[PDB]
Structure 1
Amino acid sequence: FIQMSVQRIVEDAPPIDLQAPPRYLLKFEQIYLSKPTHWERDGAPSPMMPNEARLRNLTYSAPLYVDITKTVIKEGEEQLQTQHQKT
């Protein structure tokens, strides 16, 4: 599931096109996964070990990131393709 199905689900999703004229694409490209991590208020990273998750009643989970490319077309088929990485 982690290694194949998440990427398949993301890629199979139809890109979203919006009309207010200007139009947008917003295609999701590739997924990244970090290791299970906890941040306190300080925000300093630390690996969340399962025993700490049991003791502090945390969820043992990993953050999921995706590459998103946004393109805008208004006139003259001018492409404003911009890419947001690790969203």
Structure 2
Amino acid sequence: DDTITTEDCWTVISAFFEEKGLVSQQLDSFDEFMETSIQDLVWEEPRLILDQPAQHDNINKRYEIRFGKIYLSRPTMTEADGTTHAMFPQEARLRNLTYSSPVYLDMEKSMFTSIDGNKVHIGKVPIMLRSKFCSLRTLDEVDLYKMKECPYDMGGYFVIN
């Protein structure tokens, strides 16, 4: 073979920065969170239980609800007149909005008795910019310019108010 010069080391470092970037840890952690952590936290305590040994003919009734799947969407903006539309970070910056997306949870109800259920909105989670769940992840260089976003911006932050 041939020896490895310092320029080869800088080529390897350039490959590293081409693949990872400078804010990869933030985006990777947030993507891991949104992808698995919310579902695992919901499934940590998946069963609420209420019992009532009614005697008023003894009927032991158990009421229990199960938590199912987590559904996420792209961030949306709801106006005073009632309409909705897709939100982008520049609009959130200009109008002092929060860049966040709704979270839906499947709740299943069962009515246990012994003688002896769809998507519910549970809240809005702020979205980290340029992550897998951000609207700017897909946009190419030209639409990024049309959206008034700087191509040198790297993301890794949230827009609250």
Q: For the superposition of Structure 1 and Structure 2, which TM-score range results when normalised by the shorter chain?
A: 0.7 to 0.9
Q: Which residue of 1 aligns with 2:74?
A: 35
| CA shift in 2, pair 1:65/1:8, >3 Å | same
Q: Which residue of 1 aligns with 2:47?
A: 15
Q: Which residue of 2 aligns with 1:85?
A: 118
Q: Which residue of 2 aligns with 1:2?
A: 34
Aligned residues: 80
TM-score normalized by the length of structure 2: 0.46
Q: Give the structure, 1 or 2, with the largest relative contact order (CA under 8 Å, sep 6 or more).
A: 1
Does structure 1 retain, via aligned residues, the 8 Å contact 2:50–2:62? yes
Where do 5+ consecutive residues of structure 1 fail to align?
77-83
Matched, 1:71 2:110: yes
TM-superposed deviation, 1:85: 1.4
Report % sequence identity: 45
Runs (4+) off by over 3 Å: none
Per-residue CA deviation, residues 44-73 of structure 1 (Å, 9 max, x unaligned), is: 220111011111111100000011100112
Measured on the aligned residues, the alpha-carbon RMSD in Å equals: 1.4
The higher radius of gyration belongs to 2
TM-score normalized by the length of structure 1: 0.82
Q: Which has the higher helix share?
A: 2
Where do 5+ consecutive residues of structure 2 fail to align?
1-32, 54-60, 121-161
